[PDB]
């Protein structure tokens, strides 16, 4: 009764992948696991783009349980876009497996140069029902309505460079994951794992500002103007043309993000957002922070933030629970 989960592997510290399998043959696929996208895709063997020639492709021939919606699709991210068509089939996960409506992909063209650069094969969305293209029911919620899960939640324990592995468990909470009390944050929404936190860094603040908690984002994002107020006299330096900064790893001026709610207070310290890049130069870190202006002032608590806090996404309680992870194995 050790619960079900999936092994998810640190990729150099930037981001992580859980491998999973569509088709009764459990056809291989390495994925991104994104809270924020509500749809899962994989690249068909009918794929016509150079992108695809890199990792594993779906042949629906080889599936016994294959059904075809056949309706043409185009999945859009901010990072770019994959397009294909809709299909059905069962998809196993850890010890658990069911029949799902998913987007067979045949076109990476507009997801380069990042996809053909990556190792992951498709993006398992983990988002919300009303946000699915083609009306799709989220996985975790199906495992409940199908009584296959003990609660309709999913729990994210993220890995660390050469330190320990990571585990997305789906139903119940594994205690060995966190120390200090889980704090639940209400969704200020009904399509997105986003809450209302009061983000400060030094003199600078924002208060009552949507914070998205996205598994498929490998940075913090910050309102551009807030990020500028942030960097005033801090001895960091934008890369030319790229919206990324670099700095000495030792830079003592690098702040500590602090987030307040009525309920709980959370904090990010440089070591979690600094990204060593010796590859360039000595004790030279890249910041893992991007400036990004929505219409309403918003942050995105991604890999750095999560790799800090054990984090639980409960559909039924329309909340994200947060507490501090453990050190190692
Ligand atoms: C879900 C959705 C709804 C409406 C509109 C759009 C554009 C929507 O999709 C946007 C979206 O999900 N983007 C992010 C978060 C989001 C939601 C809304 C607006 C903006 C962002 C995130 O969740 C997933 C998305 C896709 C992705 C692509 C390649 C590898 C991994 C992930 N990842 C990224 O874009 C991220 C950064 C740049 C945000 N990213 C880029 C690569 C490398 N790693 C990384 O961290
Ligand atoms: C999402 C934001 C853009 C926000 C914005 O607001 N930018 C204007 C959009 C253009 N228009 C004005 C025409 C929109 C339509 C008009 S409208 O007025 O309707 O909005 C853009 C700006 C810079 C972009 C990143 C960098 O590239 C580097 C990198 C390249 C990879 O490959 C993919 C990942 C990554 C991290 C990129 C992600 C994302 O992509 C970023 C954050
Ligand atoms: C973008 C459109 C609205 C149309 C629009 O954008 N109308 C004008 C605004 C001005 N712009 C921002 C275009 C100026 C760009 C100037 S530029 O300098 O780029 O040229 C709106 C409509 C619904 C919105 C999403 C949902 O809520 C769910 C979710 C909430 C999170 O919290 C943030 C992510 C997400 C996916 C939202 C993103 C975005 O918010 C959407 C697509």
């Amino acid at each position: 009764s050790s619960n079900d989960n999936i092994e998810l592997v640190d990729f150099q510290n930037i981001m992580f992948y859980g491998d999973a399998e569509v088709g009764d043959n459990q056809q291989p696929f390495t994925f991104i696991l994104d809270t924020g996208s509500a749809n899962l895709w994989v690249p068909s063997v009918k794929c016509t783009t150079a992108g695809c020639l890199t990792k594993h492709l779906y042949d629906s021939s080889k599936s016994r349980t294959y059904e075809k919606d056949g309706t043409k699709v185009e999945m859009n991210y901010v990072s770019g876009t994959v397009s294909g068509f809709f299909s059905k089939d069962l998809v196993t996960v850890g010890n658990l497996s069911l029949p799902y409506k998913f987007i067979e992909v045949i076109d990476t063209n507009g997801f380069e140069p990042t996809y053909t650069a990556s190792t992951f094969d498709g993006i398992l969305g983990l988002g919300w029902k009303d946000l699915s293209i083609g009306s799709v029911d989220p996985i975790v919620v199906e495992l409940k309505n199908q009584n296959k899960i003990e609660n309709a939640l999913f729990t994210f324990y993220l890995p660390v460079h050469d330190k320990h592995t990571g585990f997305l468990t789906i139903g119940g909470i594994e205690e060995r994951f966190y120390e200090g009390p889980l704090t639940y944050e209400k969704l200020n929404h009904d399509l997105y794992w986003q809450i209302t936190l009061d983000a400060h860094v030094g003199n600078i603040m924002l208060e009552k500002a949507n914070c998205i908690v996205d598994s498929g984002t490998s940075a913090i994002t910050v309102p551009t103007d807030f990020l500028n107020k942030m960097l005033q006299n801090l001895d960091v330096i934008k890369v030319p043309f790229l919206p990324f900064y670099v700095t000495l790893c030792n830079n003592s001026k690098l702040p500590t993000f602090e987030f307040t709610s009525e309920n709980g207070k959370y904090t990010l310290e440089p070591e979690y957002y600094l990204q060593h890049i010796e590859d360039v130069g000595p004790g030279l870190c890249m910041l893992n922070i991007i400036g990004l202006d929505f219409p309403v002032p918003t942050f995105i608590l991604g890999d750095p933030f999560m790799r800090k806090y054990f984090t639980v996404f409960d559909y039924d309680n329309q909340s994200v629970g947060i507490a501090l992870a453990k050190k190692n194995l």
Side-chain angles (χ1 to χ4, degrees):
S1 206
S2 146
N3 310 14
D4 54 288
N5 38 55
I6 196 54
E7 187 86 295
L8 53 90
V9 188
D10 173 339
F11 180 22
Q12 211 32 90
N13 185 274
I14 24 167
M15 59 204 76
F16 63 76
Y17 316 130
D19 54 23
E21 49 227 56
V22 105
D24 56 294
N25 30 16
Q26 302 168 252
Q27 309 206 74
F29 295 118
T30 314
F31 294 77
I32 284 288
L33 287 21
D34 175 21
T35 67
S37 60
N39 309 84
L40 165 146
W41 58 274
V42 276
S44 156
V45 257
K46 293 167 168 181
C47 178
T48 71
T49 72
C52 288
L53 275 63
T54 295
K55 222 83 197 319
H56 340 127
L57 271 48
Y58 186 52
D59 200 340
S60 30
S61 299
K62 283 210 141 28
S63 196
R64 298 295 67 73
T65 66
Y66 174 67
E67 324 178 11
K68 43 148 295 303
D69 199 305
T71 41
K72 278 183 197 285
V73 64
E74 190 150 71
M75 194 66 165
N76 305 151
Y77 305 93
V78 294
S79 79
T81 287
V82 283
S83 134
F85 87 101
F86 262 116
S87 84
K88 273 209 53 177
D89 200 281
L90 97 87
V91 193
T92 192
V93 189
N95 280 187
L96 299 69
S97 75
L98 80 168
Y100 205 66
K101 187 187 177 180
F102 74 96
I103 34 268
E104 278 199 54
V105 138
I106 42 172
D107 212 328
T108 76
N109 271 156
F111 212 68
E112 302 317 349
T114 11
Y115 182 71
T116 310
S118 330
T119 344
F120 80 95
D121 203 337
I123 279 146
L124 168 67
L126 227 174
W128 269 80
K129 41 166 287 176
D130 301 307
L131 192 83
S132 302
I133 98 286
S135 325
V136 193
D137 272 312
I139 271 61
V140 171
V141 22
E142 287 287 35
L143 291 243
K144 164 54 65 201
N145 307 345
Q146 264 86 278
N147 312 140
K148 295 196 49 43
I149 200 175
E150 258 170 11
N151 293 136
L153 97 174
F154 57 101
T155 232
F156 262 114
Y157 184 79
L158 290 204
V160 264
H161 179 82
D162 311 17
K163 264 192 50 47
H164 57 258
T165 159
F167 289 124
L168 171 58
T169 108
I170 312 157
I173 291 86
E174 225 75 32
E175 177 26 42
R176 50 150 177 170
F177 280 164
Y178 69 108
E179 29 183 19
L182 193 165
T183 315
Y184 273 89
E185 299 290 335
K186 185 68 175 292
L187 269 43
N188 67 303
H189 212 217
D190 31 353
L191 303 80
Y192 231 101
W193 302 97
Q194 113 177 347
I195 89 298
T196 284
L197 285 236
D198 307 322
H200 306 262
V201 258
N203 285 150
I204 285 317
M205 68 91 64
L206 207 58
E207 213 174 314
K208 331 215 163 188
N210 305 349
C211 323
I212 291 156
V213 189
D214 180 322
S215 54
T217 314
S218 48
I220 276 60
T221 93
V222 221
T224 30
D225 293 56
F226 188 100
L227 177 65
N228 295 341
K229 299 187 184 283
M230 253 189 66
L231 277 22
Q232 185 193 156
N233 313 127
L234 232 125
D235 304 283
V236 324
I237 325 287
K238 201 193 91 199
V239 174
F241 298 116
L242 297 200
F244 326 122
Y245 304 91
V246 321
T247 165
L248 305 193
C249 294
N250 63 72
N251 192 328
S252 288
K253 302 155 136 225
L254 269 44
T256 311
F257 295 96
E258 297 207 341
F259 301 100
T260 73
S261 61
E262 210 189 322
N263 315 32
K265 200 191 207 214
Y266 323 124
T267 74
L268 219 301
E269 23 277 79
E271 82 170 296
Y272 298 116
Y273 58 77
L274 277 124
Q275 183 55 53
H276 303 73
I277 61 143
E278 287 286 300
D279 343 316
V280 173
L284 215 314
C285 277
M286 187 202 74
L287 294 195
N288 213 166
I289 313 173
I290 298 165
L292 193 66
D293 298 296
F294 295 90
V296 47
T298 20
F299 301 59
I300 290 172
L301 308 321
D303 284 1
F305 185 108
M306 299 207 186
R307 286 168 176 264
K308 175 105 181 286
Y309 294 169
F310 177 63
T311 162
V312 29
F313 300 70
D314 188 358
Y315 287 86
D316 299 1
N317 281 168
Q318 280 70 211
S319 168
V320 173
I322 314 155
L324 308 210
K326 188 56 176 55
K327 180 68 170 170
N328 46 339
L329 76 150

